Symmetry: C2
Subunit: 104 residues, 2 copies
């Protein structure tokens, strides 16, 4: 066939990049709505807020709305969840999203 | 301000899509050399091959080379590796490349 789905020994934090809007300030631990490929919206969690992107800041999928002004995860829980994903080898995303429910 | 690195719920094993040039063929369990970074090389393992990808075929980087005529892992071992990665929520690449040295050695 044409497409090979390959497994790589990829880094630890495999996330996606989205341009933060003007006057729209958000920090890590807060849920946000971002477009997902050829399509419409889908919720996600901000892990980092850098000022550099792997791709041009021109052809970079922008953001939409900030569902939280204050991180749903505490510095405490956050330190703990990121530690669990690293120590026990679980994707950050999976640990974060599967933890949110139990938290609430 | 610019980029906000976001984590999104993703399909079971998060894999990387590559294009297989005309004439090139591979089967699950086989290692391949693939581009990584604007100009680097890296070793990966084919988990599965289908006729579709999130992005259009022409946007996929091509596999550079296949390193295995046949699977490097045993059939059973292979099915168990994919199973454990899904069941215990471990990155498939993490599992596959850590077990390789254990199993072959």
């Amino acid at each position: 066939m044409p497409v090979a789905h390959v497994a790589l020994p990829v880094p630890l934090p495999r996330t996606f990049d989205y341009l933060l809007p003007e006057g729209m300030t958000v920090k890590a631990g807060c849920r946000v709505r971002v477009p997902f490929g050829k399509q419409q919206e889908r919720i996600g969690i901000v892990v980092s807020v850098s000022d550099a992107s792997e791709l041009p800041l021109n052809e970079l999928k922008a953001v939409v709305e900030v569902l939280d002004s204050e991180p749903v995860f505490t510095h405490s829980v956050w330190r703990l969840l990121l530690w669990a994903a690293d120590y026990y080898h679980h994707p950050i995303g999976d640990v974060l999203f599967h933890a949110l429910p139990i938290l609430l």
